[PDB]
Amino acid sequence: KNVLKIRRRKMNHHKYRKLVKKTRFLRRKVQEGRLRRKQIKFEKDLRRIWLKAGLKEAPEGWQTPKIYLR
Amino acid sequence: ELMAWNQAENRRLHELRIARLRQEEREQEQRQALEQARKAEEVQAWAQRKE
Amino acid sequence: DDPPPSTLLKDYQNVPGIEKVDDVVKRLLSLEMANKKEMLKIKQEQFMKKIVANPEDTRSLEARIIALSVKIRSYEEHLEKHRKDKAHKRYLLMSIDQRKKMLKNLRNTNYDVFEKICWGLGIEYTFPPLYYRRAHRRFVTKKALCIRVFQETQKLKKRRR
Amino acid sequence: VRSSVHARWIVGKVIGTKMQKTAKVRVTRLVLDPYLLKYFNKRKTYFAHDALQQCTVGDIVLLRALPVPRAKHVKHELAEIVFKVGKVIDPVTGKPCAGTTYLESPLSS
Amino acid sequence: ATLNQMHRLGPPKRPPRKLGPTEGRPQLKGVVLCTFTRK
Amino acid sequence: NPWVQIMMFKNMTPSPFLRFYLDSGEQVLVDVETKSNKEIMEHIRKILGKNEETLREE
RNA sequence: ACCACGAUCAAAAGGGACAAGCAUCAAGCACGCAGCAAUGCAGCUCAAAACGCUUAGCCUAGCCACACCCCCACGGGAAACAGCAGU
Numbered sequence: 001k002n003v004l005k006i007r008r009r010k011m012n013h014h015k016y017r018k019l020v021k022k023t024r025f026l027r028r029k030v031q032e033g034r035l036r037r038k039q040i041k042f043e044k045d046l047r048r049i050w051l052k053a054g055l056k057e058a059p060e061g062w063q064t065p066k067i068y069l070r
Numbered sequence: 071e072l073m074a075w076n077q078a079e080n081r082r083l084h085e086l087r088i089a090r091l092r093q094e095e096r097e098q099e100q101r102q103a104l105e106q107a108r109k110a111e112e113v114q115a116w117a118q119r120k121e
Numbered sequence: 122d123d124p125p126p127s128t129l130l131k132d133y134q135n136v137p138g139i140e141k142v143d144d145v146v147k148r149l150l151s152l153e154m155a156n157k158k159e160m161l162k163i164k165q166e167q168f169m170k171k172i173v174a175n176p177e178d179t180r181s182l183e184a185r186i187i188a189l190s191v192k193i194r195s196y197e198e199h200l201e202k203h204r205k206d207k208a209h210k211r212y213l214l215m216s217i218d219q220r221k222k223m224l225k226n227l228r229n230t231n232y233d234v235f236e237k238i239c240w241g242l243g244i245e246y247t248f249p250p251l252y253y254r255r256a257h258r259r260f261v262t263k264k265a266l267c268i269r270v271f272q273e274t275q276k277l278k279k280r281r282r
Numbered sequence: 283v284r285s286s287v288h289a290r291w292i293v294g295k296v297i298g299t300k301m302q303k304t305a306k307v308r309v310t311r312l313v314l315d316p317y318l319l320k321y322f323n324k325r326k327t328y329f330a331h332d333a334l335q336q337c338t339v340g341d342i343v344l345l346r347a348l349p350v351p352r353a354k355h356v357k358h359e360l361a362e363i364v365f366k367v368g369k370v371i372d373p374v375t376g377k378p379c380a381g382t383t384y385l386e387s388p389l390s391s
Numbered sequence: 392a393t394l395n396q397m398h399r400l401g402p403p404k405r406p407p408r409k410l411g412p413t414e415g416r417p418q419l420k421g422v423v424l425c426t427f428t429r430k
Numbered sequence: 431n432p433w434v435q436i437m438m439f440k441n442m443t444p445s446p447f448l449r450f451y452l453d454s455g456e457q458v459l460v461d462v463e464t465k466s467n468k469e470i471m472e473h474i475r476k477i478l479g480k481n482e483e484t485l486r487e488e
Numbered sequence: 489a490c491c492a493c494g495a496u497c498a499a500a501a502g503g504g505a506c507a508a509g510c511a512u513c514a515a516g517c518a519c520g521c522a523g524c525a526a527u528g529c530a531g532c533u534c535a536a537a538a539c540g541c542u543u544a545g546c547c548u549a550g551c552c553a554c555a556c557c558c559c560c561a562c563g564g565g566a567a568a569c570a571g572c573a574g575u
C-alpha cells in the first residue's frame with residue numbers, strides 16, 4: 001500500500017486542525033451570521049407561501065419557530 | 071374460425087390435464103396412505119414413552 | 122392472556138389416563154413448574170386450533186405467521202423488563218419485518234386466510250410508506266404551515282361562496 | 283372514432299383506492315433501451331372510474347377508455363377485475379387457487 | 392456494472408470541455424500594458 | 431408489436447397461460463402448459479398473427 | 489363539389505409522445521376525486537427524478553419561435569433595415 005497518501009492525509013488534517021484553532025473566534029461569528037441568514041431565508045419562504053395562497057397575513061396562531069438557533 | 075379452433079385446443083388440453091391430474095391423485099393417495107401409517111406408528115411409540 | 126399455570130404440558134396432554142394421577146403429578150406436569158417456552162408452545166397450539174384449518178400442518182404460511190407472532194410477543198414481554206437489550210430489540214424488529222413479509226405474501230395468495238389471521242392474532246396490516254426520507258425540522262414546519270394555509274384558504278373560499 | 287382517449291384497453295395493478303369511485307392503477311409497458319437493447323418496465327398511473335368501489339389495492343384490473351374524459355385525470359373506467367387480490371380463479375380450469383396451488387381440485391367437478 | 396445498473400445510470404456524461412485562455416477563440420486582440428522578461 | 435401492452439405475472443396460477451385482449455372486448459385464452467416455446471409462438475401466430483400475404487401487401 | 493352528398497387542406501379544444509447538464513435543485517404546497525346542483529371526501533405529483541436552476545433554435549424536401557422594448561400590446565417607453573444594397 002502507498003504510505004505516502006496516508007502521510008499526506010496526516011499532514012493535511014494536522015494543517016487543517018491548526019487553522020481552525022487559529023481562526024476559531026472568527027469562525028463562530030461567521031457561523032452565527034450564516035444561521036441568522038438561514039432563519040431569515042426560511043421565514044421568507046414561509047411568507048411567500050402564505051402570500052401567494054392569498055392570505056394577507058400569516059394563518060391565525062402561526063408563529064415561525066426558530067429551527068436553527070441552538 | 072380461428073377463435074373456435076383455439077377454444078377446441080384449450081378443451082383438448084383440459085382433457086389431457088384431467089387425465090394427468092387423476093394419475094397424480096392416485097399416486098398421492100398411495101403415498102399419503104403410507105405416510106399416514108408411518109405417522110401413526112411414530113405417534114404410538116412416542117405416546118408410550120411419555121406414558 | 123396467558124394459559125392458566127394449571128394447564129398440562131403439550132407433551133403430556135394426550136397420554137391416556139392423565140386425569141387419574143395425583144395432584145402432585147399434575148403440578149409436576151403443568152405450566153406452573155416449567156420455563157416460559159412451554160407456555161409459548163401452548164399459546165402456539167391454542168392459536169393454531171383457533172385459526173388454521175389444519176392445525177397439524179406447521180409448514181403453511183399461516184402456521185409460520187402464528188409461530189412468529191408468538192415469538193414476537195415473547196420478545197416484547199422480554200423488552201418491557203429489559204429496556205437496554207439492544208440485541209433483543211434487533212430480534213423484535215427483524216421478527217416484525219419477517220411477519221409483515223409473510224402477511225404480504227398471504228394477502229397476495231389467500232385473502233380469506235389472511236383475514237382470519239389478522240382477526241385471530243389481533244394484527245393490523247398496514248401498507249408500507251411510498252418514500253423513505255428524513256422529516257427534518259424545516260420540512261416539518263413548512264408542511265404544518267402549508268396545511269394551515271390550505272385550511273385558511275378553504276375558509277375564505279367558503280365565505281366568498 | 284369511438285373515443286378521444288389514446289389508451290383504449292390497458293391492464294394494471296390497483297395502487298390506490300383513497301378517492302371516491304376512483305381507483306389509481308399502475309400500468310407497466312415494455313420499453314427498449316436504445317443502448318442495451320433490453321426491455322425494461324416503464325410505469326404510468328391511470329385513474330379509473332369505479333362506480334361500485336369494488337377495487338382493492340393490489341388487484342389486477344382491466345381499464346377501458348371513456349368516450350370522453352369525465353375529469354382532469356379520469357379518462358378510463360374499470361371494465362373488469364382480471365385477478366382479485368388473494369382471490370384468484372384459475373382461468374384455465376376455473377377453480378380457486380392460492381398461488382401455484384389449487385384450493386379446490388379440478389377433478390372434484 | 393450490471394445491466395440494471397447501466398440502465399439506471401444511463402449513457403456516460405462526458406463533462407463540458409474547459410475553455411482555455413482564449414475562451415475557445417482562435418485569436419484575441421490586446422493592448423500592451425507592460426513589457427518584462429521571465430525566467 | 432411496439433404498441434401492444436405486454437405484461438407478465440409470476441406464480442399467480444397453478445399453470446401457465448396467455449391471454450390476449452382485443453379491441454372488440456373479446457378475450458383469447460391460450461393454455462401453454464406442456465408446450466414448447468416454439469409451439470406457443472406458432473400457435474399465437476396462427477390464431478392472432480397476420481399471414482404472409484397481408485405483410486407482403488403492406 | 490360550388491346546389492350538397494363528400495373529398496382535400498388545416499385552426500381552436502381534448503388524449504398521447506418529445507433536447508442537454510445539475511439531486512450540493514428532495515420534497516412541491518392545493519398541485520385530487522365524487523355529485524344535476526347543494527355540498528362532501530382529503531386527496532394529487534415525486535429518487536422509475538416531481539418542484540427548481542442553468543444551457544441550447546430543432547428531429548433539416550423542412551419545421552418551430554420572433555418581427556425595436558414592456559412574454560402579450562388596450563396602453564406605455566419611444567420612433568424601430570433580424571427585406572435588398574449600404575453604413
Ligand SMILES: NC(=O)c1ccc[n+]([C@@H]2O[C@H](COP(=O)([O-])OP(=O)(O)OC[C@H]3O[C@@H](n4cnc5c(N)ncnc54)[C@H](O)[C@@H]3O)[C@@H](O)[C@H]2O)c1
Pocket residue numbers: 251252253254255535
Ligand atoms: N427514494 C425512495 O424513497 C425510494 C422509494 C421506492 C424505491 N426506491 C428504490 O431504492 C433505490 C435507491 O433509490 P435512490 O438512488 O434514488 O436513493 P438515494 O440513495 O439516492 O437517496 C435518496 C432518498 O432515497 C432513500 N433511499 C435510498 N436508498 C433506498 C432504498 N433502497 N429504498 C428506499 N429508499 C431509499 C434515502 O433515504 C433518501 O432519502 C432505487 O432503486 C429506487 O428504485 C427508493
Ligand SMILES: [K+]
Pocket residue numbers: 554
Ligand atoms: K417578443
Ligand SMILES: [Mg+2]
Pocket residue numbers: none
Ligand atoms: Mg391544434
Ligand SMILES: [Mg+2]
Pocket residue numbers: none
Ligand atoms: Mg434593429
Ligand SMILES: [Mg+2]
Pocket residue numbers: none
Ligand atoms: Mg412583441
Ligand SMILES: [Mg+2]
Pocket residue numbers: 569
Ligand atoms: Mg441590409
